[PDB]
């Protein structure tokens, strides 16, 4: 007859049934992912409904228990994870309506159909066709018309759905004393735990704003260089003292830049370091491709994937024997199950995604000690960061010729590797102002300084003042742009991407300070350093148990976000990029 101990007993009773039903749900999800048959669809739907129903039942059981002044500082965080009843806190009619709305959101994003008036019946859709047209064609007017028409036909139906989405989710956040849905998303970063390691919302948005402020000049000079190369290519319609439209930015939305590599490459006499010619000779297969990744993780000190998981995992697409999804996934089913699922090619893009997925699996090995309810990263963004650290090490020529893969004569020099750093700068740097811009838009719409009707002017003003992109045609509320993203219809936040970038650069700086291989950050390796493996695995095993601030103290010694690793990594570029970038206009003009 003790009450805190009774709560602990309830925690045990929850977690045991939760794990042995979550395995049943996730195995059915994997069976759906293996062969597409309606038996698997029915099994997955039934298992998911069972899992959600039981989760709601222990959620009610946890909500009935008192929470005031109950602390082991670990059980308390488990109950903070389990207190949330979901969207059924209000009248359930509006919650079911909201789920129906989200289903409509996903379907209309999946069917964002646009066709030309010349051939209305013969046309292409968003995912397979428009992307390859953008990545291949360089036409100004055709891409502009396709971009504008797609955004108009999307925004005409995406405007009111979001407009009455925000008003409902305001009161949904007002339940349980939160102020807005952006504040709820920032409460994923909340640490109301042990004192001295505190973390709240206001200094979170302050940290994001400040870190972007020290990010800003490097993006500004990369933007100026990119616009200089585009003016070297296409100088006619756009003035060289202003912004550029988004439909020459390599993507319709602008959330990537890698498609501009072919247009904006300097030092073109040396194509990039490519060994794809040599698996005509070495004839490497995907299973042993995984085997060098496993040898890499044993080399740094981390444990290896157990032998049974080789026949658990799917290492090759089925082919014509049946159809399946082609998406690199790291399935942690539960009960110590870890599978890798992708349609495996032989190129280094597949090798790099293999390293990222193996990092995901290895982190999943690492936090296996904690209970089921705490089996996520210390924040929302360590999963996509741990694999991203391993993505950097395999890229350098030193790793390829240390394992003897590269021809020995290449190595590195003064003339090269700018062509390697600018590829990453197009991959990594340009994403950060875009994610900061739109997520600040969404959070400050939730803060309410924007009127709900007038969502276009502060959009375009912030785009000119942060990422420097100009609309060529003015938009009213019917021509709704920001809802057209992939993740807006799915209601996902992008802070995981900015945070994973800053975090894995801090991790690269940290793990290059415990490996003795000293130099500029890009040409240093993680391979075979036992102290580095100890520091990394000390971070990795924590899970959600201790707060993420202490998790990041375990490796770098700094609680908050520090962009100095990013600046040091991209500064070998920055000694040269701004020097070639001089004698041009600097900054964004709002008039253009």
């Amino acid at each position: 007859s003790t009450i805190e101990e009774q709560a602990k007993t309830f925690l045990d009773k929850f977690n045991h049934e939760a794990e042995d039903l979550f395995y049943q749900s996730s195995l059915a999800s994997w069976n759906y992912n293996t062969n597409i048959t309606e038996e698997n669809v029915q099994n997955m739907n039934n298992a998911g409904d069972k899992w959600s129903a039981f989760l709601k039942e222990q959620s009610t059981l946890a909500q009935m228990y008192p929470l005031q002044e109950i602390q082991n500082l670990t059980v308390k965080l488990q109950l903070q994870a389990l207190q949330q009843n979901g969207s059924s806190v209000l009248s359930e009619d509006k919650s079911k309506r909201l789920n129906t709305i989200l289903n409509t959101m996903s379907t209309i994003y999946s069917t964002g159909k646009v066709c030309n008036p010349d051939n209305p019946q013969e046309c292409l859709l968003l995912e397979p066709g428009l992307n390859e047209i953008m990545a291949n064609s360089l036409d100004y007017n055709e891409r502009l018309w396709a971009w504008e028409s797609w955004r108009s036909e999307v925004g005409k139906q995406l405007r009111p759905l979001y407009e009455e989405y925000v008003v409902l989710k305001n009161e949904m956040a007002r339940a349980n004393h939160y102020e807005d849905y952006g504040d709820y998303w920032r409460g994923d970063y909340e640490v109301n735990g042990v004192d001295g390691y505190d973390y709240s919302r206001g200094q979170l948005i302050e940290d994001v704003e400040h870190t972007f402020e020290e990010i800003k000049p490097l993006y500004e000079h990369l933007h100026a260089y990119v616009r200089a190369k585009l003016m070297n290519a296409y100088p006619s319609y756009i003035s060289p003292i202003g912004c550029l439209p988004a439909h020459l930015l390599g993507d319709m939305w602008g959330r990537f830049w890698t498609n501009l590599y072919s247009l904006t490459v300097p030092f073109g006499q040396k194509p990039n370091i490519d060994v794809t010619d040599a698996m005509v000779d070495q004839a490497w297969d995907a299973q042993r491709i995984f085997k060098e990744a496993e040898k890499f993780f044993v080399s740094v000190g981390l444990p290896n994937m157990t032998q049974g998981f080789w026949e658990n995992s799917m290492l090759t697409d089925p082919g014509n024997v049946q159809k399946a999804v082609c998406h690199p996934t790291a399935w942690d089913l539960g009960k110590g199950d870890f599978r890798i699922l992708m349609c495996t090619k032989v190129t280094m893009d597949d090798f790099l995604t293999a390293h990222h997925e193996m990092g995901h699996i290895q982190y999943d090995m690492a936090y296996a000690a904690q209970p089921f309810l705490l089996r996520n990263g210390a924040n929302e963004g360590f999963h996509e960061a741990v694999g991203e650290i391993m993505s950097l090490s395999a890229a350098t020529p030193k790793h390829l010729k240390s394992i003897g893969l590269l021809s020995p004569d290449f190595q590195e020099d003064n003339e090269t590797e700018i062509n390697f750093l600018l590829k990453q700068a197009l991959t990594i740097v340009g994403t950060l102002p875009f994610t900061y811009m739109l997520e600040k838009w969404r959070w400050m719409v939730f803060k309410g300084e924007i009127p709900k009707d007038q969502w276009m002017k502060k959009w375009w003003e912030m785009k000119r003042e942060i990422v420097g992109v100009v609309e060529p045609v003015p938009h009213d509320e019917t021509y709704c742009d920001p809802a057209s993203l992939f993740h807006v219809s799915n209601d996902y936040s992008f802070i995981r991407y900015y945070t994973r970038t800053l975090y894995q650069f801090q991790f690269q700086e940290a793990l290059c300070q415990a490996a003795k291989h000293e130099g500029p950050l890009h040409k240093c390796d993680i391979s075979n350093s036992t102290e580095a493996g100890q520091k990394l695995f000390n971070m990795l095993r924590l899970g959600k148990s201790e707060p993420w601030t202490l998790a990041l103290e375990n490796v770098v010694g700094a609680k908050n976000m520090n962009v100095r690793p990013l600046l040091n990594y991209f500064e070998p570029l920055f000694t040269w990029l701004k020097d070639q970038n001089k004698n041009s206009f600097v900054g964004w003009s709002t008039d253009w």
Binding site: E17, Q24, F309
Partner: protein, 195 residues
Amino acid sequence: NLCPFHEVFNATRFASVYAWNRKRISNCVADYSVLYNFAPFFAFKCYGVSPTKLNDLCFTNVYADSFVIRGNEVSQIAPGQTGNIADYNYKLPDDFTGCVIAWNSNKLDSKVSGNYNYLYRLFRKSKLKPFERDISTEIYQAGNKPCNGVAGFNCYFPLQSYGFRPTYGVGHQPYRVVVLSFELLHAPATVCGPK
């Protein structure tokens, strides 16, 4: 006299942890060689006896137990070690004499559809005495004022299921374990070593 360890180790049904099968040995001279002859074993570490002195001393009585546990907690069956299966289901003596055997049973003691057969108990009133066995509906009535005995809200059942799937990984697959306890009471002669 050869007594059949062929029924002790190799069988069809082993019970769960809350009811270990207690088998007494007092009328045989057992061939202590199956530990090398049967199978490669997960656990041969044991506090009690050494493989050299198993046959040297004339041991008068033997007890044998068989059940199945998780691969993570094979080392948990030991004197001093604490946890929800050691000190609540099967507690070892502090200076227990004997050697314990464990083998992976994933080959046949696991169903792909699932095996909701074995159970384990999560809470007695306190840590149970070693070699104390209970099989009862011990409904841990967690009432702020008590659950009146059966079939209601707030009434947490003691025994938790032990679901089994061969798709699991090492450390969570089934691992059956047999223990051999050796006793000499203030006793006459019942069993002696072979010549």
